[PDB]
Write a protein that binds this ligand. Structure first.
Ligand SMILES: Cc1ncc(-c2ccnc(Nc3ccc(S(C)(=O)=O)cc3)n2)n1C(C)C
Ligand SMILES: C[As](C)(=O)[O-]
Length: 351
């Protein structure tokens, strides 16, 4: 219940730890370990995450979480605390711990519960989740924030199915990018990696996140990842197999040397998803194609995508989640920093 003061690496950390009680383990994996706890002062459920930092790469979880904590964005986790603990199996190891609010599920697990029981997720849940995921990157990509997550995947998109809410987390791989400065192209889970990253480009933009989001939209409607390659070239083959071979000019723009594959005509979305009951499939598929453009600049930007006709029914107070609950109150609650950068047409539609 109490966190063990003896595991604090220092006084500051012992004092932060005393704010929280541990209820139980929530999940463990390659990233580290997430415990469900409570803030003792408010009762609030928290995720206490013990961060495992791969020394081959730059981990920016704490610094990016601190920059985002100023915004209070309804679709991004809010840092509550950070502190350092000694390792369980070897006390010479010290770990960063970040505390944020707890969200009960991942989008991966929520979708997998439907597919495993032979049901596709309800269309209105896919739609409300997508709206929120796009809003989360909208916020990250603002000029005032300039954060590229670079590892968006169903496993770090958090959801509460009961109230239709969604939050983005897991910012260890995130970075503010500049066209002047180079980056590591091998970031992101291979299945969600944009073509410019498959090509090993060291200069790339926040549009890599848009690709990842499109990939997730497809996976929510398919039940498995849409582009499943065994390697970088395998990944391009799978993309080209589904979307069709782009022109040589497009391939030359993406290939850094600017100077090689089957000429697939691509599969229509209708044959990929086989969902004849989806009443607005045409809109859904238009949106998907607008996110999954080969050239980064051609991809639909988040605030334009929020105004896409696929999302029209989210404006109707009569629209309900599958359990008959109202849509989340915060869907159309925008931050001043978001509103002040919108076009007049986007403000009219969304605010
Ligand atoms: C990587 C990461 N960084 C922060 C979180 C995070 C943040 C807030 N809430 C939760 N809740 C949660 C955790 C694990 C599971 S599980 C393993 O049973 O699927 C289900 C819900 N987690 N996480 C998550 C994505 C592990
Ligand atoms: C090595 As890097 C792209 O995380 O600054």
């Amino acid at each position: 219940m109490s966190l063990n003061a003896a595991d604090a690496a220092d006084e500051r950390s012992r004092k932060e730890m005393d704010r929280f009680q541990v209820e139980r383990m929530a999940g463990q994996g390659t990233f580290g370990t997430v415990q469900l706890g409570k803030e003792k002062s408010t009762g609030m459920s928290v995720a206490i995450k013990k961060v495992i930092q791969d020394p081959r790469f730059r981990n920016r979880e704490l610094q990016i979480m601190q920059d985002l904590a100023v915004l209070h964005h309804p679709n991004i986790v809010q840092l509550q605390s950070y502190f350092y603990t000694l390792g369980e199996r070897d006390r010479r190891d010290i770990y960063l711990n970040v505390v944020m609010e707890y969200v009960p599920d991942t989008l991966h697990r929520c979708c997998r519960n439907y597919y495993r029981r032979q049901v596709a997720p309800p269309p209105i849940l896919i739609k409300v989740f997508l709206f929120q995921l796009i809003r989360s990157i909208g916020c990250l990509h603002l000029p005032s924030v300039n954060v590229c997550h670079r590892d968006i995947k169903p496993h770090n998109v958090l959801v509460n199915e009961a109230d239709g809410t969604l939050k983005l987390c897991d910012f260890g791989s995130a970075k503010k990018l500049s066209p002047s400065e180079p980056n590591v192209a091998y970031i992101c889970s291979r299945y969600y990696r944009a073509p410019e990253l498959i090509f090993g480009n060291q200069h790339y933009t926040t549009s890599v996140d848009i690709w990842s989001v499109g990939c997730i939209f497809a996976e929510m409607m398919l039940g498995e990842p849409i582009f499943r390659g065994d390697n970088s070239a395998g990944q391009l083959h799978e993309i080209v197999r589904v979307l069709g071979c782009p022109s040589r000019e497009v391939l030359r723009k993406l290939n850094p040397s600017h100077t090689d594959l089957y000429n697939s005509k691509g599969i229509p979305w209708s044959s990929v998803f086989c969902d004849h009951s989806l009443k607005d499939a045409k809109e859904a598929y238009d949106l998907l194609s607008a996110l999954l453009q080969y050239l980064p600049e051609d991809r639909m930007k988040p605030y334009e995508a929020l105004c896409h006709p696929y999302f029209d029914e989210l404006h109707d107070s009569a629209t309900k989640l599958p359990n008959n609950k109202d849509l989340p109150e915060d869907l159309f609650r925008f931050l001043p920093s978001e509103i002040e950068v919108m076009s007049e047409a986007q403000k009219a539609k969304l605010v």
